[PDB]
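Hey Z.,

So I finally got round to the zinc ion thing we talked about over coffee. Here's the setup:
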Amino acid sequence: STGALVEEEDPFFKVPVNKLAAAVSNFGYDLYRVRSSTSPTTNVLLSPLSVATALSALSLGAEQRTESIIHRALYYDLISSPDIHGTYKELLDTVTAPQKNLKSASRIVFEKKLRIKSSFVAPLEKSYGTRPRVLTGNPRLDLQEINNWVQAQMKGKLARSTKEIPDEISILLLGVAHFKGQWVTKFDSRKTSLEDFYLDEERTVRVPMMSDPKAVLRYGLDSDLSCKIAQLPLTGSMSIIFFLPLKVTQNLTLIEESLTSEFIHDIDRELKTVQAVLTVPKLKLSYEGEVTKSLQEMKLQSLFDSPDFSKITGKPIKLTQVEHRAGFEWNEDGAGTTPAHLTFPLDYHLNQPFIFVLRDTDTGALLFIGKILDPRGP
Ligand SMILES: [Zn+2]
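And the result:
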């Protein structure tokens, strides 16, 4: 009984920037689901906000039908906003503020010699703080310039791309993000040690495992999903929510099917503070790849056929590539250290495949999502 335009009753989602954050985050969970389906045996690491942002910005140059196609994928058609792009600037300003430890940037890149209308550039730069790049047609220079842009946006925290530049670009969208933050409570690195990680029912590896035997966290068991949910706070009003299956498995699909902005808000409200025997693997992960094909499965295929971008230029152009680069890291770093007496202990050992969601507490925005089949790497 959903899909109708109704007034928002949930207080957290009445806030326009939170309503927008929930919309583009729901695009991000959609993209995550497609990628995870495509990658049943490899880690999935995504920061889809940078991709949603490139698409939202590009929709400024779309005529009405194409614009609506982009807006439907971003869930804008369920918002009743007079200023979607003004709200977006606020969203971006909030989640990339310095305390968030999150670098995120989106770029629109056009085929060589394209003449761009200043009536596109002006709202693009105002709301998204970005300017379109027109390629030169020299593959070496063009790849060097894009990597130099990623380097400056990410302050060198991502690896430069040794990937060849695509041969036939009309519109290329680039979404890049890096996150390395600090826990509210540091892990004692003296307690970090090599421990078993159950890749699956038959394969066990040894991985640097952080440990807090007396962790305070927020926790809840979701019986319907057979998974233990824990939330660990980060400095700068963010948290990581973990989804830990009860049985060793790489099949997280049932959990993945539930991931929406509204589900995650509900989970967050329902978690309760407990003490836990907590283990968390160290993570230093990176991803570089094209999400072109995944977006084509997300009702965006017509952007690649004959879309109408005549608000950008008179020359017929179309989406040809959407690139994502992401880097993500967590270690023991944190801001601080911490006749009967009864406790309620729980174990929370992330020593088997799990999903994590890095969420902004203020807006609820999805900042990063990982399916971690193997904490060592790809
Ligand atoms: Zn609520």
